[PDB]
From Swiss-Prot, chain A:
The lineage of its organism: Eukaryota, Metazoa, Chordata, Craniata, Vertebrata. Signal peptide: none annotated. The modification N6-acetyllysine is found at K16. The chain holds residues 283 to 376 of 376 of the full protein. Component of the 19S proteasome regulatory particle complex. The 26S proteasome consists of a 20S core particle (CP) and two 19S regulatory subunits (RP). The regulatory particle is made of a lid composed of 9 subunits including PSMD13, a base containing 6 ATPases and few additional components. Component of the 26S proteasome, a multiprotein complex involved in the ATP-dependent degradation of ubiquitinated proteins. This complex plays a key role in the maintenance of protein homeostasis by removing misfolded or damaged proteins, which could impair cellular functions, and by removing proteins whose functions are no longer required. Therefore, the proteasome participates in numerous cellular processes, including cell cycle progression, apoptosis, or DNA damage repair. This is 26S proteasome non-ATPase regulatory subunit 13. Belongs to the proteasome subunit S11 family. It comes from the Eukaryota.
Swiss-Prot record, chain B:
It comes from Homo sapiens. The modification Phosphoserine is found at S68. Widely expressed. Highest levels in heart and skeletal muscle. Component of the 26S proteasome, a multiprotein complex involved in the ATP-dependent degradation of ubiquitinated proteins. This complex plays a key role in the maintenance of protein homeostasis by removing misfolded or damaged proteins, which could impair cellular functions, and by removing proteins whose functions are no longer required. Therefore, the proteasome participates in numerous cellular processes, including cell cycle progression, apoptosis, or DNA damage repair. The chain holds residues 157 to 310 of 310 of the full protein. Component of the 19S proteasome regulatory particle complex. The 26S proteasome consists of a 20S core particle (CP) and two 19S regulatory subunits (RP). The regulatory particle is made of a lid composed of 9 subunits including PSMD4, a base containing 6 ATPases and few additional components. Within the complex, PSMD4 interacts with subunit PSMD7 through their respective MPN domain. Interacts with TXNL1. Belongs to the peptidase M67A family. PSMD14 subfamily. The modification Phosphothreonine is found at T101. This is 26S proteasome non-ATPase regulatory subunit 14.
Curated annotation (Swiss-Prot), chain D:
It is found in: Nucleus; Cytoplasm, Cytosol. Induction: By FOXO4; expression in embryonic stem cells (ESCs) is mediated by FOXO4. This is 26S proteasome non-ATPase regulatory subunit 11. The chain holds residues 371 to 422 of 422 of the full protein. Component of the 26S proteasome, a multiprotein complex involved in the ATP-dependent degradation of ubiquitinated proteins. This complex plays a key role in the maintenance of protein homeostasis by removing misfolded or damaged proteins, which could impair cellular functions, and by removing proteins whose functions are no longer required. Therefore, the proteasome participates in numerous cellular processes, including cell cycle progression, apoptosis, or DNA damage repair. In the complex, PSMD11 is required for proteasome assembly. It comes from Homo sapiens. Highly expressed in embryonic stem cells (ESCs). Expression decreases as ESCs differentiate.
Curated annotation (Swiss-Prot), chain E:
Component of the 19S proteasome regulatory particle complex. The 26S proteasome consists of a 20S core particle (CP) and two 19S regulatory subunits (RP). The regulatory particle is made of a lid composed of 9 subunits including PSMD6, a base containing 6 ATPases and few additional components. The chain holds residues 196 to 389 of 389 of the full protein. Residues 1-166 form the PCI domain. Belongs to the proteasome subunit S10 family. Keywords: Proteasome. Signal peptide: none annotated. One of its GO terms (cellular component) is secretory granule lumen. This is 26S proteasome non-ATPase regulatory subunit 6. Component of the 26S proteasome, a multiprotein complex involved in the ATP-dependent degradation of ubiquitinated proteins. This complex plays a key role in the maintenance of protein homeostasis by removing misfolded or damaged proteins, which could impair cellular functions, and by removing proteins whose functions are no longer required. Therefore, the proteasome participates in numerous cellular processes, including cell cycle progression, apoptosis, or DNA damage repair. It comes from the Eukaryota. The keyword Transmembrane helix does not apply. GO terms for biological process: proteasome-mediated ubiquitin-dependent protein catabolic process. It comes from Homo sapiens.
Length: 94, 145, 286, 52, 194, 152
């Protein structure tokens, strides 16, 4: 739901919204270790539940449309900056 | 590839000189070196073989040639640095014997024939190899954005 | 379970002169033919094939013509020259398919453990790959219907087997082996950047046209499943790879230290004997 | 005596052990280039000799 | 070259040139207390016994060397001060012994700094006495003499050991040569022109 | 038993006294209870060998989340004391089966791996696991793309 960083999440939304306590969040991921969709490297000096790779969703057709700000972003930005490299690496065409 | 036209002893009435267009059998005449065939100048004169202007296939052999033989879809290489690790240990491990040549250039007045030039083979390896290391350093900020 | 095959362009040049047949025999546009070869492994080689006199009605597209005068006795010839080079599959041109193709596969799956259909290219202008394989698949659904048989995208390649360049690399008459770091890398930059991101534009054709007019394979079983793989790193502002920047100090660490010390060694390389042979050539000229 | 590669402390009195000596990237290349400087100095008399 | 040239101690018992061999023993010890490395120290004064017995009659010298192998510092002050009393009263030193003592001391201090990092001076004043403001001018000048790579604080009292070679100066010396060298023979490369 | 063998699910040890203790509360076969835990100077070696299972196996499962944990939290999570903890540190560090390096300077230590002992491998893993996936991308995106563009 938040795609961005702070993926080393504190347990606060975990202990709040997922109706769990502080002593069980480890079980909440160690059982999830037996699940294996997410394999976070959970901090234990700060109790921070870290986010690694996941099985994300099932369907967000509003983001099958609204994926343009990532897909076309990737397209014209890796392609445009591709042409910024090749526009810098221009007259070594030789 | 090789090809021959059997001339015969019936046609020795005329001389065995077609010649009408020349420099095609002049450049077929340019090798004229096969041991028993040079010997078999009697009874044999070869034929000229060009290769056809095959761009109806040389085009597609070209496009599958280079569309195929450089990373295919070319999102494959874009291994990188342990090769350099091994290559940097190459590219230090030859450097002490590469630098024995300035000792071998210390002949003071003159005592040496041809310099025994080992200047190259270690310039350009570092050159194109570390062009590959620096654009290889680019590929993070090229692939990502 | 097929990754790749070895493709000899010899009988592809027989697809070239049968591509010369179809331009002068008449109405038949597409070059369709039957692929010989031998399964050795997941990797395979194709050394021969043959191109079929084939017709295809535009109305009821599943009308095949694979004559068995043309099949059986020519398989007796092709068997008679070599017991090894038997059938492995078949081919046709066009990029996508043919409403008959699946049936044409099943005519020769009685002949082969895996009759492959490799859809071929007579006019290469492509952004992706050359001719590519399609193996026998039964993926069906999670539904429990009768068994699906449409032959799915099982990766292949153009492999090169043996010497054969007494002809080929004599017929190059243009090309140079680049010592990579000599522009070949930017050729790959144009082909993967451009030819990858126009395929990304095909993927916005997918993820825009399927939003627009796309039915049931809009989200069959791989779109969200590889929106995971899309969710490696798609993030919003700058994606914030904070590990990757002092990790990048560990990276550019290496490249700038090697370039620094090593290109100072290159300063000895160029500079020193450049001066020696320089001034020998200069003042020893007098 | 190099049986023990660490650092002690008194202010907090906290001993910490860690080591990474070898960098032949710095060592080998750097000292080889110092030798290269010596051989360039060996060439400077071919230089000063071809001058005068 | 003093200690290295005094390596044999075999063919020089007492010649007509040698009015005292024990003065020669002082002459090799007074420089093997500087130039000699610590494994070379145990290699000479411990692995070699041929000099040991003629300084076994000089047990304060031998004590100063084994203390030097130990780093106990009050007897460094004592017997080093005695060595300084001799150093006043012996020729061929008077233009030279200004360099001696403090270098001696930094020959002790560095391995002292190799002891550990965050040192206090009171732990040092155990071995120093009142080395509080003594080490002010002493250590502050030793930093100021381009030596004694450290940092020092008054009240939080940080002492620093560092100087990791693979850092900058090993990266520096080659262009230190190849700049004045580069402009030098480059300047020689233009006398051919004009 | 088999539940304890796969991630063990850090159970209460007195509930292990419930399951493995009420086998003597059996109105049937007690010959399992007698042969295994009816022993006394071998059976208590199996009770404390099962304490060796809680510290051994639970250190084996907690190995994923280290490079950052304190010491008292480790005692809290191993369901035992801090001196019992340090004894378990000692025998599992002479075990040295996984590269333990502990401390009490402030406590933040662990049974541990060799603590990321490498340079540039982070680039490979990070950018070459991730970017070699990223060069896998278009190679299968043509497969999905061409297979979904059959009919639309």
């Amino acid at each position: 739901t938040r795609p961005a960083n702070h993926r080393q999440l504190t347990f606060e939304e975990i202990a709040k919204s997922a109706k769990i306590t502080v002593n069980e969040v480890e079980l909440l991921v160690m059982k999830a270790l037996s699940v294996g969709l997410v394999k976070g490297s959970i901090d234990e000096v700060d109790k921070r539940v870290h986010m690694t790779w996941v099985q994300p969703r099932v369907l967000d057709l509003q983001q099958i449309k609204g994926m343009k700000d990532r897909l076309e972003f990737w397209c014209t930005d890796v392609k445009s900056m591709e042409m910024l490299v090749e526009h810098q690496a221009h007259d070594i065409l030789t | 590839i090789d090809a021959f036209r059997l001339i015969n002893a019936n046609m020795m009435v005329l001389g065995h000189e077609p010649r009408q267009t020349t420099s095609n059998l002049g450049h077929l005449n340019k090798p004229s070196i096969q041991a028993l065939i040079h010997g078999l100048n009697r009874h044999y004169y070869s034929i000229t073989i060009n290769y056809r202007k095959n761009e109806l296939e040389q085009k597609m052999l070209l496009n599958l040639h280079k569309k195929s033989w450089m990373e295919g879809l070319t999102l494959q290489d874009y291994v990188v640095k342990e090769m350099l690790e091994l290559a940097k240990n190459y590219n230090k491990a030859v450097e002490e014997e590469d630098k024995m040549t300035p000792e071998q250039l210390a002949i003071k007045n003159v005592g040496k024939q041809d310099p025994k030039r080992h200047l190259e083979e270690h310039v350009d390896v570092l050159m194109t190899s570390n062009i590959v290391q620096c654009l290889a350093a680019m590929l993070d900020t090229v692939v990502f954005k | 379970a097929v990754q790749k095959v070895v493709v000899h362009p010899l009988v592809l040049l027989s697809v070239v002169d049968h591509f010369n047949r179809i331009g002068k025999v008449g109405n038949q546009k597409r070059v369709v033919g039957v692929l010989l070869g031998s399964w050795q492994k997941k990797v395979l080689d194709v050394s021969n094939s043959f191109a079929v006199p084939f017709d295809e009605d535009d109305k009821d597209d599943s009308v095949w013509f694979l004559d068995h005068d043309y099949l059986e006795n020519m398989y007796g010839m092709f068997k008679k020259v070599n017991a090894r080079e038997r059938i492995v599959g078949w081919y046709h041109t066009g990029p996508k398919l043919h409403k008959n193709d699946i049936a044409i596969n099943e005519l020769m799956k009685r002949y082969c453990p895996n009759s492959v259909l490799v859809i071929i290219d007579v006019k290469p202008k492509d952004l992706g790959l050359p001719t590519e394989a399609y193996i026998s698949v039964e993926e069906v659904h999670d539904d429990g219907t009768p068994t699906s048989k449409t032959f799915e995208h099982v990766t292949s390649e153009i492999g090169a087997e043996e010497a054969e360049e007494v002809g080929v690399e004599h017929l190059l008459r243009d090309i140079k082996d680049t010592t990579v770091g000599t522009l070949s890398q930017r050729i790959t930059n144009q082909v993967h950047g451009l030819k990858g991101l126009n395929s990304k534009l095909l993927d916005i054709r997918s993820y825009l046209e399927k939003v627009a007019t796309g039915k049931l394979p809009i989200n069959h079983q791989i779109i969200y499943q590889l929106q995971d793989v899309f969710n490696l790193l798609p993030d919003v502002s700058l994606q914030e790879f904070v590990k990757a920047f002092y990790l990048k100090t560990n990276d550019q660490m290496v490249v700038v230290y090697l370039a620094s010390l090593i290109r100072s060694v290159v300063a000895l390389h160029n500079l020193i004997n450049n001066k020696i042979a320089n001034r020998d050539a200069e003042k020893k000229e007098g | 005596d190099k049986k023990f590669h660490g650092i002690l402390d008194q202010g907090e009195g906290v001993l910490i052990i860690f080591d990474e000596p070898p960098v032949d990237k710095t060592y080998e290349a750097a000292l080889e280039t110092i030798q290269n400087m010596s051989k360039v100095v060996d060439s400077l008399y071919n230089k000063a000799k071809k001058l005068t | 070259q003093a200690a290295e040239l005094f390596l044999d101690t075999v063919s020089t018992f007492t010649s007509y040139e040698l009015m005292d061999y024990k003065t020669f023993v002082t002459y090799t010890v007074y420089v093997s207390m500087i130039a000699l490395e610590r494994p070379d120290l145990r290699e000479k004064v411990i692995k070699g016994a041929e000099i040991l017995e003629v300084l076994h009659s000089l047990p304060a010298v031998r004590q100063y060397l084994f203390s030097l192998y130990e780093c106990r510092y009050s007897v460094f002050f004592q017997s080093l001060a005695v060595v300084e009393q001799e150093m006043k009263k012996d020729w061929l030193f008077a233009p030279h012994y200004r360099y001696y003592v403090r270098e001696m001391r930094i020959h002790a201090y560095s391995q002292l700094l190799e002891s550990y990092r965050s040192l206090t001076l009171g732990y040092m004043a155990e071995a120093f006495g009142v080395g509080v403001e003594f080490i002010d001018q002493e250590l502050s000048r030793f930093i100021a003499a381009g030596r004694l790579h450290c940092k020092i604080d008054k009240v939080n009292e940080i002492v620093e050991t560092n100087r990791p070679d693979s850092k900058n100066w090993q990266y520096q010396e080659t262009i230190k040569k190849g700049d004045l060298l580069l402009n030098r023979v480059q300047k020689l490369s233009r006398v051919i022109n004009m | 038993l088999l539940k304890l063998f796969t991630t063990m699910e850090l159970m209460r040890w007195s509930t292990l006294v419930e399951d493995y203790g009420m086998e003597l509360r059996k109105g049937s076969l007690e010959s399992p209870a007698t042969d295994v835990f009816g022993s006394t100077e071998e059976g208590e070696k199996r009770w404390k060998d099962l304490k060796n299972r809680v510290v051994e196996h639970n250190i084996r499962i907690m190995a994923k989340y280290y490079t950052r944990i304190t010491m008292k939290r480790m005692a809290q999570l191993l369901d035992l004391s801090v001196d019992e903890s340090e004894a378990f540190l000692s025998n599992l560090v002479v075990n040295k089966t996984i590269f333990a390096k502990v401390d009490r300077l402030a406590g933040i230590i662990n049974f541990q791996r060799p603590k990321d002992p490498n340079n540039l491998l982070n680039d490979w893993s990070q950018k070459l696991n991730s970017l070699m996936s990223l060069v896998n991308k278009t190679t299968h995106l043509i497969a999905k793309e061409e297979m979904i563009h059959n009919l639309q």
